[PDB]
Amino acid sequence: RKLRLLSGYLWPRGSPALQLVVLICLGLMGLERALNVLVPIFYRNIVNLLTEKAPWNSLAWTVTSYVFLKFLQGGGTGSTGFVSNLRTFLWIRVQQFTSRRVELLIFSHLHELSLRWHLGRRTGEVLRIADRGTSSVTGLLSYLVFNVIPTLADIIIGIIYFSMFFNAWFGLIVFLCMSLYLTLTIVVTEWRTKFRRAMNTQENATRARAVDSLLNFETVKYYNAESYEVERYREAIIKYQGLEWKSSASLVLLNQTQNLVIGLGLLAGSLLCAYFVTEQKLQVGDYVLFGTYIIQLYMPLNWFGTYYRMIQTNFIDMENMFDLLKEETEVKDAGPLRFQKGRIEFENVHFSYADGRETLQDVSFTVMPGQTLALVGPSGAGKSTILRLLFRFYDISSGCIRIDGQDISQVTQASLRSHIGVVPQDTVLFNDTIADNIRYGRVTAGNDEVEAAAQAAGIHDAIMAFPEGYRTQVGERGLKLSGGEKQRVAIARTILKAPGIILLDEATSALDTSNERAIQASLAKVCANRTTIVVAHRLSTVVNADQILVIKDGCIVERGRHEALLSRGGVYADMWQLQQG
Amino acid sequence: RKLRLLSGYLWPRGSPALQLVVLICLGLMGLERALNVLVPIFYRNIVNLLTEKAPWNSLAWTVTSYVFLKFLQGGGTGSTGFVSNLRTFLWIRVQQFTSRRVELLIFSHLHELSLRWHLGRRTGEVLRIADRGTSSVTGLLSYLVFNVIPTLADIIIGIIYFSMFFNAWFGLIVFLCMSLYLTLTIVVTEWRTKFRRAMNTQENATRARAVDSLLNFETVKYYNAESYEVERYREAIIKYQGLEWKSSASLVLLNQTQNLVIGLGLLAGSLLCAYFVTEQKLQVGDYVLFGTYIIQLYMPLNWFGTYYRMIQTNFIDMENMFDLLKEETEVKDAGPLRFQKGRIEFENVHFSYADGRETLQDVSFTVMPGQTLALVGPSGAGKSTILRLLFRFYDISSGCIRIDGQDISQVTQASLRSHIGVVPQDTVLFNDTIADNIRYGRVTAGNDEVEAAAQAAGIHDAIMAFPEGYRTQVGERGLKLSGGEKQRVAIARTILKAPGIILLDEATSALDTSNERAIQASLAKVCANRTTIVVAHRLSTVVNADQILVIKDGCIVERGRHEALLSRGGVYADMWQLQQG
């Protein structure tokens, strides 16, 4: 029901050179379970031969055959022997194939859902639930396959032996001891997680008194305390040293129940075995075959107290990922957009972000190809929201959006935004060379075309004054350049794309008045036959526009050219006279 | 040379009920080294008795005497046995006496040095070097006393035995094997710290590409990439999976050198021992006394590879604390200040913060007792700096400061600031009840006097509108109250102190004009016969002052009363006419 999705990540589903390593690393697990009943048997045989005064020529070939199987097979769990850690040297290339196919299945999925970040608030906690869900599937798989199943199949082949070859009372002793050694490890461990979660609470409430009694050394000197903060940092460090005594003297109780159980299963077994040797039913060596075989049989059952938490944690830390992969796209688009001329039309579009307010109410216009449209108005009117719906980040509630007589909701969204190039309002940059931030528009462009269209952005003479040339660094999100040099890169990128429809949220905000008409005249021989939608707060830029739209609260109050709204005396003429003086 | 200061923290220097536990926990370390040569010897004896067909009545009292010493003495290091973890149940009360005397020796030392925070920039890194230097002395002491010295004295009593009682070639084999098992653990471990410090560098440079390609999902949709961030997150996750293969297949080389050394010291020893038994120089049981005694002799030498770093780290993480405790106070004061009337005098005081600029130049005035002095001027003139030197946070360069004809540099600074009560400019509060923030002035005051002098601060009718009464919470640094309710607590605290000299940096800054003269008239029946120094930017408060001082750049330009500077027409009269309109 839940391991049915885990075992799909065991078999790598492809690349059959890694379908062979899985069979070898499950064939050195079967060899390892047949060396825990060879070495002990060999040891008893040596003891018997020594007792029967065997010749030296027939005894040196059964001592070097024993030490070789003590090299082959492991020691304890401290010195792990050659068969194990050869299925660790070969298992690296199988858990470096599950930690690459899983976190390229969600990172290629967070970019395709919607304009809702990642169905989370910050991406600092969505990439945390993503890197933690990849280091859980691999870990969980490893524990069950190599640490839990082998351990619980090394006791069952240690009860059918001592059942076959011994006196059938020994098997019962082993079963009773091992079961107790296990139900008094799981019970007392989850009785101790009560004690440390009330310990990590207090120690951060003790250390939050030493900090804020030194964040203001400024104030403790006026009233001359200087000792009263010592007599109440002692009184909160003694309260903490009575709640770690209950978590360091409750681990001693755990290591006196795990010791008294294995100190009685080795008493009621050894004494019985000695008696049998006396009755000549067994011999010497079968007493040494019991003291050796028990000690290698409970030490793998000792690190099952760690694994009861790290497996229980990795089912709530693993299904957090597997419904993150089941989140609906919602905005999914169908033939490609057939772009011919660039005629943009809205027909009565209504839009709302979160249904409380209508952001755009009955927005309608028509842009003929080769014409520049101007959007003006106050802040928060809905100006950049129109340039979000044309690019289709968001679905509209009603109405229709047409480009060359074709609805944008019908065609594919990957072909809609190939003819549209928009410079953002506040521009972000990648954390690399600026010659790659400019070529990111059309990535197949050469170095001769990047430098050519960076002349049209007006930054070309500003980069040659820099050291290191075009491949200097911007830092993260372009913060090492400027406010204005950051922005002229974003105009430059759009020109390398050379889109059919050009959109400009903000282009002159951080630039002075001498640098707009160096670009606006340069964009005018770029926007000669290509559709342009511009919106600016400064009002001298949109004088030579073709049609000016005024937006107050998401509703168009008046439209027309520049001279038709100055003689009208509406809200545009009052906005023009307010800026002239 | 450096363990001479470590062994002083072993002996607790007092409380002789914890000078007895140190002798018991060093007497269960001598019992534990004499159970590693009792249990193996007992085991050989049992084997010999079985061979010689001993009677059952004389064999059951040497098997239950063996299992009892396997309960008493430990198992491996996984199931630690009763003698150990009885010097862990008793050692808690000795390392809870060193983790309380050390971090009350530095926390009572950071409040006594100077007005330089803590000779650091932020207290978030001075309390980090302080809590880390306390969890180092205890840890280091434990490792050497209980983990390193016992281990290296359990091999030397395993060479003088096999030297005495065996055939004098065995001792050499043990010495050769153990030494190699140790110089091929220290060498290969510090050959592997090269490989992981170049692994933690790359993994944070891989994970800083997934974050900033999702901090702006805003920008990657315009140029329609959505796959180009996948084809360069794969190309930087394969660069990382070639630098953890060199750190997970160089640990396999460590566990094939620690295995081949102990797989040859148990070959060249066991074969020789078997030969001796054949020559009837030894017997059966002396072959089992060698296979048992080696395996318990290298497993304590296995966790010496962890302890070579955690001890080397704790000498650079420990002497960072022991010159932090050797930092000079510098400003140390001598009889107590004899306060009679409260006559404050400066005689040509000069002062500089960092020797580049003279902050105060030839400041001189005289305040008769029972009079209010006013300081005015622009921002950054040196107004609050005068109220720092009178309280003596800082030593002056030249000149003299006198209170009632007594220099403040001569008397003790703990008696100087008992007659002076200053409200700070921006007021900070403790993170508890507001009835404790008000009683922190005089801590021995009762609840009837806190509520009485909170009436004089004007907050008394504002707290009874709150829920929970006087013991409501302010949060950390008073941010839960207000800007103005935060400040009226700081006036209130000063009144409970009732000092001889009252200082007011800012008292009306966050209060409106209706709440100053509710306090200023209320302070006027508090400041009736007690010296007051006030400084305010609003100029209506200091009209009825006794003497007004004007400070431009740390130099007094003009002084006198209110009417004597309006008729003078100086810089005070131009500052008065600028505020009237």
Side-chain angles (χ1 to χ4, degrees), chain A residues 1-56 58-117 119-120 123-327 334-581, chain B residues 1-56 58-117 119-120 123-327 334-581:
Chain A
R1 77 278 188 191
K2 192 213 286 185
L3 274 75
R4 64 176 177 87
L5 66 120
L6 181 62
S7 66
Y9 294 99
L10 182 63
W11 188 256
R13 288 189 290 223
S15 179
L18 293 176
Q19 294 176 356
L20 182 64
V21 182
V22 178
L23 293 175
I24 296 171
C25 294
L26 293 177
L28 295 177
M29 189 182 74
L31 181 63
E32 200 15 14
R33 301 279 76 76
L35 291 171
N36 296 118
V37 293
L38 267 189
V39 176
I41 298 192
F42 257 84
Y43 201 45
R44 58 165 294 267
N45 297 349
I46 307 175
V47 177
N48 275 309
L49 289 185
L50 260 329
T51 314
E52 303 153 0
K53 278 79 175 176
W56 175 249
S58 177
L59 193 144
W61 292 101
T62 184
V63 173
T64 63
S65 178
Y66 172 70
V67 183
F68 180 73
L69 289 178
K70 188 67 177 176
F71 176 75
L72 226 247
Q73 189 269 124
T77 318
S79 295
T80 310
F82 186 76
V83 166
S84 178
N85 77 27
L86 186 66
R87 64 174 177 87
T88 303
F89 180 76
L90 270 67
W91 187 254
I92 295 169
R93 297 290 183 185
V94 184
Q95 71 179 359
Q96 289 179 356
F97 184 76
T98 310
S99 295
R100 188 173 64 241
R101 187 175 61 83
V102 169
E103 60 183 358
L104 289 173
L105 184 62
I106 56 175
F107 185 77
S108 178
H109 183 270
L110 264 63
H111 286 89
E112 292 181 353
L113 41 90
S114 190
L115 218 216
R116 262 77 141 134
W117 308 278
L119 273 359
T123 61
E125 61 91 18
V126 184
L127 270 300
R128 215 115 226 153
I129 200 170
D131 101 70
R132 190 177 178 180
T134 304
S135 297
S136 66
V137 179
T138 56
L140 222 271
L141 187 60
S142 177
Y143 291 144
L144 298 183
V145 73
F146 295 141
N147 297 338
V148 180
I149 295 302
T151 300
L152 293 175
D154 190 33
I155 300 170
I156 301 172
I157 66 170
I159 294 171
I160 60 97
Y161 184 77
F162 293 173
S163 260
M164 252 244 312
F165 296 96
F166 273 181
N167 257 335
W169 283 101
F170 296 102
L172 187 63
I173 301 298
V174 175
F175 174 70
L176 259 47
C177 183
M178 294 313 166
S179 175
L180 292 177
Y181 187 78
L182 186 62
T183 64
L184 294 174
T185 298
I186 297 170
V187 167
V188 186
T189 302
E190 68 184 3
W191 182 65
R192 287 182 65 250
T193 60
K194 182 172 70 176
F195 285 161
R196 357 177 241 187
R197 70 179 182 178
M199 183 183 74
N200 289 319
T201 302
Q202 184 61 252
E203 59 94 22
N204 201 2
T206 298
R207 241 217 236 94
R209 188 62 192 270
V211 172
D212 346 343
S213 176
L214 282 171
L215 287 175
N216 49 5
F217 181 76
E218 181 71 28
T219 237
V220 307
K221 296 295 291 294
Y222 298 125
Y223 300 106
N224 198 1
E226 344 185 357
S227 298
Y228 187 73
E229 288 294 323
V230 181
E231 261 39 13
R232 292 197 293 118
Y233 182 70
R234 182 180 294 115
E235 290 228 339
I237 202 168
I238 295 173
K239 187 180 288 293
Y240 175 66
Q241 288 178 355
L243 277 121
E244 73 177 2
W245 182 72
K246 291 181 181 179
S247 178
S248 295
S250 178
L251 184 62
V252 176
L253 184 63
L254 181 61
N255 289 319
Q256 295 297 320
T257 304
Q258 292 180 355
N259 193 10
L260 191 145
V261 170
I262 203 66
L264 289 175
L266 191 143
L267 180 62
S270 165
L271 199 57
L272 185 65
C273 190
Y275 181 74
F276 284 134
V277 179
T278 314
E279 314 303 308
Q280 289 87 20
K281 293 177 124 122
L282 274 62
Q283 66 269 15
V284 188
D286 286 331
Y287 177 78
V288 189
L289 196 251
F290 183 76
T292 302
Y293 192 80
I294 295 298
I295 293 174
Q296 73 180 3
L297 194 64
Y298 68 90
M299 284 183 179
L301 195 64
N302 194 3
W303 287 277
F304 189 77
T306 300
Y307 293 164
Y308 185 71
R309 291 290 90 194
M310 294 298 107
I311 292 171
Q312 184 59 255
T313 305
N314 291 322
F315 288 112
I316 54 96
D317 202 1
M318 183 268 285
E319 198 173 2
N320 286 319
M321 185 179 72
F322 277 100
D323 335 339
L324 181 62
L325 192 144
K326 300 201 307 288
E327 288 173 340
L337 184 69
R338 289 186 290 113
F339 184 77
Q340 294 178 357
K341 296 298 293 295
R343 184 175 179 178
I344 300 169
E345 292 178 353
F346 287 179
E347 288 85 5
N348 302 113
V349 57
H350 297 285
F351 180 73
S352 296
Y353 284 101
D355 198 76
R357 62 188 182 274
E358 290 183 353
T359 300
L360 296 175
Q361 293 179 356
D362 198 0
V363 175
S364 295
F365 56 90
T366 298
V367 179
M368 295 302 291
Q371 292 179 356
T372 301
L373 191 73
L375 298 171
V376 294
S379 296
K383 294 184 286 185
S384 296
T385 304
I386 294 173
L387 294 176
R388 297 289 180 88
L389 297 178
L390 184 61
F391 199 83
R392 195 182 177 183
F393 290 111
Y394 290 152
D395 285 331
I396 62 173
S397 66
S398 66
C400 183
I401 295 172
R402 294 182 184 273
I403 294 172
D404 292 332
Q406 295 180 358
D407 194 0
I408 69 165
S409 296
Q410 299 293 319
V411 300
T412 62
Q413 64 182 357
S415 66
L416 174 63
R417 64 187 68 186
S418 66
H419 298 286
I420 296 169
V422 48
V423 49
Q425 187 175 5
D426 47 353
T427 70
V428 291
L429 299 175
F430 286 155
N431 194 350
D432 52 357
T433 65
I434 88 170
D436 191 33
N437 296 119
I438 299 170
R439 76 175 68 250
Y440 187 72
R442 190 176 65 243
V443 71
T444 62
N447 198 4
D448 54 354
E449 199 270 331
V450 174
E451 184 175 358
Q455 183 68 43
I459 200 168
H460 179 274
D461 289 332
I463 309 165
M464 295 300 174
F466 289 164
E468 289 93 9
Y470 279 168
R471 78 286 199 279
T472 186
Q473 298 295 321
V474 294
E476 190 173 4
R477 304 193 128 187
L479 271 72
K480 286 186 179 180
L481 289 176
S482 177
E485 297 173 352
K486 185 193 265 79
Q487 194 173 8
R488 294 197 297 268
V489 176
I491 286 97
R493 284 192 313 195
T494 305
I495 301 169
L496 271 79
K497 187 178 180 182
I501 298 168
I502 302 170
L503 308 180
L504 301 97
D505 306 355
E506 267 186 356
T508 63
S509 57
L511 305 180
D512 57 348
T513 186
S514 179
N515 285 317
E516 65 221 11
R517 74 276 312 278
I519 297 170
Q520 186 63 255
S522 179
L523 288 174
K525 64 177 71 67
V526 174
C527 298
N529 296 114
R530 292 191 291 267
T531 302
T532 303
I533 311 297
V534 69
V535 42
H537 293 86
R538 62 185 67 187
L539 197 56
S540 66
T541 63
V542 296
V543 177
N544 201 0
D546 186 75
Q547 183 181 3
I548 299 170
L549 271 292
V550 181
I551 300 165
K552 294 296 290 183
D553 286 328
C555 183
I556 288 95
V557 292
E558 61 185 1
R559 68 184 68 189
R561 295 179 66 90
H562 181 73
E563 70 271 15
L565 271 68
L566 291 176
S567 66
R568 185 177 292 173
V571 70
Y572 182 77
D574 290 330
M575 186 174 70
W576 179 258
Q577 294 297 109
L578 187 144
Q579 189 174 1
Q580 295 295 321
Chain B
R1 77 278 188 191
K2 192 213 286 185
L3 273 75
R4 64 176 177 87
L5 66 120
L6 181 62
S7 66
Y9 294 99
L10 182 63
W11 188 256
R13 288 189 290 223
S15 179
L18 293 176
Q19 294 176 356
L20 182 64
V21 182
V22 178
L23 293 175
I24 296 171
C25 294
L26 293 177
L28 295 177
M29 189 182 74
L31 181 63
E32 200 15 14
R33 301 279 76 76
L35 291 171
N36 296 118
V37 293
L38 267 189
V39 176
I41 298 192
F42 257 83
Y43 201 45
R44 58 165 294 267
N45 297 349
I46 307 175
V47 177
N48 275 309
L49 289 185
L50 260 329
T51 314
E52 303 153 0
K53 278 79 175 176
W56 175 249
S58 177
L59 193 145
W61 292 101
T62 184
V63 173
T64 63
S65 178
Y66 172 70
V67 183
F68 180 73
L69 289 178
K70 188 67 177 176
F71 176 75
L72 226 247
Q73 189 269 124
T77 318
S79 295
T80 310
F82 186 76
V83 166
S84 178
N85 77 27
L86 186 66
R87 63 174 177 87
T88 303
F89 180 76
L90 270 67
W91 187 254
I92 295 170
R93 297 290 183 185
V94 184
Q95 71 179 359
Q96 289 179 356
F97 184 76
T98 310
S99 295
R100 188 173 64 241
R101 187 175 61 83
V102 169
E103 60 183 358
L104 289 173
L105 184 63
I106 56 175
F107 185 77
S108 178
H109 183 270
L110 264 63
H111 286 89
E112 292 181 353
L113 41 90
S114 190
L115 218 216
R116 262 77 141 134
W117 308 278
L119 272 359
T123 61
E125 61 91 18
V126 184
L127 270 300
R128 215 115 226 153
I129 200 170
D131 101 70
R132 190 177 178 180
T134 304
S135 297
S136 66
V137 179
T138 56
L140 222 271
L141 187 60
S142 177
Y143 291 144
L144 298 183
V145 73
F146 295 141
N147 297 338
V148 180
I149 295 302
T151 300
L152 293 176
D154 190 33
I155 300 170
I156 301 172
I157 66 170
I159 294 171
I160 60 97
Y161 184 77
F162 293 173
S163 260
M164 252 244 312
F165 296 96
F166 273 181
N167 257 335
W169 283 102
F170 296 102
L172 187 63
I173 302 298
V174 175
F175 174 70
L176 259 47
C177 183
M178 294 313 166
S179 175
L180 292 177
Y181 187 78
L182 186 62
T183 64
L184 294 174
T185 298
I186 297 170
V187 167
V188 186
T189 302
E190 68 184 3
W191 182 65
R192 287 182 65 250
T193 60
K194 182 172 70 176
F195 285 161
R196 357 177 241 187
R197 70 179 182 178
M199 183 183 74
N200 289 319
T201 302
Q202 184 61 252
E203 59 94 22
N204 201 2
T206 298
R207 241 217 236 94
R209 188 62 192 270
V211 172
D212 346 343
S213 176
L214 282 171
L215 287 175
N216 49 5
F217 181 76
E218 181 71 28
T219 237
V220 307
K221 296 295 291 294
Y222 298 125
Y223 300 106
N224 198 1
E226 344 185 357
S227 298
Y228 187 73
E229 288 294 323
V230 181
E231 261 39 13
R232 292 197 292 118
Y233 182 70
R234 182 180 294 115
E235 290 228 340
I237 202 168
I238 295 173
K239 187 180 288 293
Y240 175 66
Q241 288 178 355
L243 277 121
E244 73 177 2
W245 182 72
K246 291 181 181 179
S247 178
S248 295
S250 178
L251 184 62
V252 176
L253 184 63
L254 181 61
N255 289 319
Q256 295 297 320
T257 304
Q258 292 180 355
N259 193 10
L260 191 145
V261 170
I262 203 66
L264 289 175
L266 191 143
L267 180 62
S270 165
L271 199 57
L272 185 65
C273 190
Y275 181 74
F276 284 134
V277 179
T278 314
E279 314 303 307
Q280 289 87 20
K281 293 177 124 122
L282 274 62
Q283 66 269 15
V284 188
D286 286 331
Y287 177 78
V288 189
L289 196 251
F290 183 76
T292 302
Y293 192 80
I294 295 298
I295 293 174
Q296 73 180 3
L297 194 64
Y298 68 90
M299 285 183 179
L301 195 64
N302 194 3
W303 287 277
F304 189 77
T306 300
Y307 293 164
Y308 185 71
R309 291 290 90 194
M310 294 298 107
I311 292 171
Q312 184 59 255
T313 305
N314 291 322
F315 288 112
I316 54 96
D317 202 1
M318 183 268 285
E319 198 173 2
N320 286 319
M321 185 179 72
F322 277 100
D323 335 339
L324 181 62
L325 192 144
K326 300 201 307 288
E327 288 173 340
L337 184 69
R338 289 185 290 113
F339 184 77
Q340 294 178 357
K341 296 298 293 295
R343 184 175 179 178
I344 300 169
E345 292 178 353
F346 287 179
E347 288 85 5
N348 302 113
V349 57
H350 297 285
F351 180 73
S352 296
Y353 284 101
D355 198 76
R357 62 188 182 274
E358 290 183 353
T359 300
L360 296 175
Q361 293 179 356
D362 198 0
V363 175
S364 295
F365 56 90
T366 298
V367 179
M368 295 302 291
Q371 292 179 356
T372 301
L373 191 73
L375 298 171
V376 294
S379 296
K383 294 184 286 185
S384 296
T385 304
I386 294 173
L387 294 176
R388 297 289 180 88
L389 297 178
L390 184 61
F391 199 83
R392 195 182 177 183
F393 290 111
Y394 290 152
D395 285 331
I396 62 173
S397 66
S398 66
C400 183
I401 294 172
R402 294 182 184 273
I403 294 172
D404 292 332
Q406 295 180 357
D407 194 0
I408 69 165
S409 296
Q410 299 293 319
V411 300
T412 62
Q413 64 182 356
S415 66
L416 174 63
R417 64 187 68 186
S418 66
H419 298 286
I420 296 169
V422 48
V423 49
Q425 187 175 5
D426 47 353
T427 70
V428 291
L429 299 175
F430 286 155
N431 194 350
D432 52 357
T433 65
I434 88 170
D436 191 33
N437 296 119
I438 299 170
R439 76 175 68 250
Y440 187 72
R442 190 176 65 243
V443 71
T444 62
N447 198 4
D448 54 354
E449 199 270 331
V450 174
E451 184 175 358
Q455 183 68 43
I459 200 168
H460 179 274
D461 289 332
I463 309 165
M464 295 300 174
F466 289 164
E468 289 93 9
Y470 279 168
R471 78 286 199 279
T472 186
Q473 298 295 321
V474 294
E476 190 173 4
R477 304 193 128 187
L479 271 72
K480 286 186 179 180
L481 289 176
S482 177
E485 297 173 352
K486 185 193 265 79
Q487 194 173 8
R488 294 197 297 268
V489 176
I491 286 97
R493 284 192 313 195
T494 305
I495 301 169
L496 271 79
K497 187 178 180 182
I501 298 168
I502 302 170
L503 308 180
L504 301 97
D505 306 355
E506 267 186 356
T508 63
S509 57
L511 305 180
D512 56 348
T513 186
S514 179
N515 285 317
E516 65 221 11
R517 75 276 312 278
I519 297 170
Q520 186 63 255
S522 179
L523 288 174
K525 64 177 71 67
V526 174
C527 298
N529 296 114
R530 292 191 291 267
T531 302
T532 303
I533 311 297
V534 69
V535 42
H537 293 86
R538 62 185 67 187
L539 197 56
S540 66
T541 63
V542 296
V543 177
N544 201 0
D546 186 75
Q547 183 181 3
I548 299 170
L549 271 292
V550 181
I551 300 165
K552 294 296 290 183
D553 286 328
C555 183
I556 288 95
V557 292
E558 61 185 1
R559 68 184 68 189
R561 295 179 66 90
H562 181 73
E563 70 271 15
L565 271 68
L566 291 175
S567 66
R568 185 177 292 173
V571 70
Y572 182 77
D574 290 330
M575 186 174 70
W576 179 258
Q577 294 297 109
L578 187 144
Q579 189 174 1
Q580 295 295 321

